[PDB]
Target: Pterin Binding Protein
Amino acid sequence: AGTIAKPQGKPILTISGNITNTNAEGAAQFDRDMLEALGMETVETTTPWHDGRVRFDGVSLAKLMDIVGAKGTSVTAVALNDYVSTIPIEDFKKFNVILAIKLDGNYMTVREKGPLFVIYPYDSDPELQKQTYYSRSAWQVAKLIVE
Ligand SMILES: [Cl-]
Ligand code: NA
Ligand code: NA
Ligand code: NA
Model:
């Protein structure tokens, strides 16, 4: 039986891998309404890719790992362009990493590297202002695979 509700709209995120809570064969599929329903956090920061300080609204990745019952310690983020970013799951609770859904109050289209973007609060901690965390940021996210 499924433990995650089925999406009513077009799924924009699939979580798979070593998870226990699903709504499809070995996977948890989310439409945008389901992601927004998990609760939206706000992160304001300068970044290597944006002009000036920008504001992201998105869902806590720690909350996504909790609802799918992630059993791993690493997540592979798969982008639309088929390149991956590898992220230690420990980063999610340590730095309040979000799966961004909005940028400056607007949804993100494909040419803005949306609809989903893994974002760290770079300016909140000097530790996050370096390539280690810029490479763990993942734009055009389509999938999260728990290893
Ligand atoms: Cl577009
Ligand atoms: Na699975
Ligand atoms: Na936009
Ligand atoms: Na990346």
About this structure: Helices lie at 32-37, 61-68, 90-95, 131-136.
